[PDB]
Amino acid sequence: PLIVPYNLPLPGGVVPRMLITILGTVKPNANRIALDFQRGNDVAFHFNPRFNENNRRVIVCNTKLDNNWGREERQSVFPFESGKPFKIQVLVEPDHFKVAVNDAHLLQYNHRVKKLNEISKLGISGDIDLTSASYTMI
Numbered sequence: 001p002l003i004v005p006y007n008l009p010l011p012g013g014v015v016p017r018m019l020i021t022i023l024g025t026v027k028p029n030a031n032r033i034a035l036d037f038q039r040g041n042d043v044a045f046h047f048n049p050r051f052n053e054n055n056r057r058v059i060v061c062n063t064k065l066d067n068n069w070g071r072e073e074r075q076s077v078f079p080f081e082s083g084k085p086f087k088i089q090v091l092v093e094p095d096h097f098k099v100a101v102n103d104a105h106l107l108q109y110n111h112r113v114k115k116l117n118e119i120s121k122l123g124i125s126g127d128i129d130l131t132s133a134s135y136t137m138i
């Protein structure tokens with residue numbers, strides 16, 4: 001078991017073919033989960049499943065540059081469930097991050113922050129118990 005908010009260093013930054021695997025359980029009555037890939041103070045890729053946003057379940061993706069959020073990308077396919085275990089996989093590809101939850105493809109986020117080698121921290125927060133956070137090269 002790991003403490004949330006959790007900070008996972010990505011030594012040397014992200015690189016294509018890097019695979020991050022996050023295992024946890026969603027807390028009962030969860031409101032939000034967030035993954036934040038950080039380049040310093042900037043958030044290169046924010047992945048933010050919201051459990052109740054006007055009585056809708058929704059995934060928000062965005063980038064925060066110089067403290068300003070940009071244009072949001074919204075996915076209404078929502079594979080998370082309160083109280084239940086999940087696996088999130090982020091595969092880094094040349095042009096996008098590819099996210100799969102519970103072995104099923106969820107979304108792609110085109111790279112807005114282009115200096116991939118400077119995205120060197122992954123922050124994990126929200127209404128989860130965190131079992132495992134790691135990476136490997138596929």
Ligand SMILES: OC[C@H]1O[C@@H](O[C@H]2[C@H](O)[C@@H](O)[C@H](O)O[C@@H]2CO)[C@H](O)[C@@H](O)[C@H]1O
Nearest residue numbers: 034046048060061062063069070071072
């Ligand atoms: O965009 C990610 C960012 O959003 C914030 O909430 C947004 C909200 O989604 C939007 O509809 C409203 O107009 O602006 C808010 C602030 O930009 C969250 O507060 C923040 O945590 C991020 O998740």
